[PDB]
């Protein structure tokens, strides 16, 4: 059987978001609106071709988008955003109803200094169009062609030939 081919190690060094998970949930929605215009290109590549080792460059592109977004939120307002995510951090499985007043504080911060309307329910949905340079690929299910049809039935049928053609009981 045929052997596989992968990109080597020197293709897979892209600097990654080495932040934790609690803060990454804490800044979810405004990441969903500010960036993530080109990650749906990554998602479209991933669904139309279920072959990573084909779509990874859009992964690099969304990696650098998210890194730029966290650079932008670090070097500006808010510093009590850090208090916000460490406030949601110790509340078990995370709820958005518990540490809510600091979320409104962080939202007042971002609306005054920068903008970034928090999106409504259910605006992180609502199936989306996008277009790229690449075409839709042929046979993403890698296979042969389907072999043959049936030699099928076409034409009327006559009366039966001389009867049953059993031992007797002719006609």
């Amino acid at each position: 059987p045929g052997i596989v081919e992968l990109p080597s190690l020197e293709d897979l060094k892209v600097q990654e978001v080495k932040v934790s998970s609690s803060v990454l949930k804490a800044a979810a929605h405004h990441y969903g609106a500010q960036c993530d215009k080109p990650n749906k290109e990554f998602m479209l590549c991933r669904w139309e071709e279920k072959d990573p080792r084909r779509c990874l460059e859009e992964g690099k592109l969304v990696n650098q988008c998210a890194l730029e977004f966290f650079r932008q939120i670090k070097r500006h307002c808010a510093e009590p955003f850090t208090e916000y995510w460490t406030c949601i951090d110790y509340s078990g499985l995370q709820l958005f109803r518990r540490c809510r007043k600091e979320q409104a504080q962080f939202d007042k911060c971002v609306l005054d200094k920068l903008g970034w309307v928090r999106p409504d329910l259910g605006e992180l949905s609502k199936v989306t169009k996008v277009k790229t340079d690449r075409p839709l690929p042929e046979n993403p299910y890698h296979s042969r062609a389907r072999p043959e049809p049936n030699p099928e039935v076409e034409g009327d049928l006559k009366p039966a030939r001389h009867g049953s053609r059993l031992f007797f009981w002719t006609m």
Partner: protein, 74 residues
């Protein structure tokens, strides 16, 4: 009569009869269906753009497409 001999039997038939008959007529079942439909478990896919169709809003803040709004609006 019908009540004194088996009272809990009558009360059980009564609340069972309303639990059968009452799910027919209600002003709320369409709300139950829409709430139950519009909660996305899986991921709503992006697609190759269009055959120039007047739907499928591009931005997630573009108000063309279908929207859930009555959670805030009772």
């Amino acid at each position: 009569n019908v009540w004194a001999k088996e009272p809990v039997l009558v009360a059980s038939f009564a609340i069972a009869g309303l639990a059968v008959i009452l799910p027919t007529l209600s002003p709320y079942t369409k709300y139950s269906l829409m709430i139950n439909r519009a909660t996305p478990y899986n991921y709503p896919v992006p697609l190759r753009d269009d055959g120039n169709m007047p739907d499928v809003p591009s931005h997630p803040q573009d108000p063309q497409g279908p929207s859930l709004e009555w959670l805030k609006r009772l």
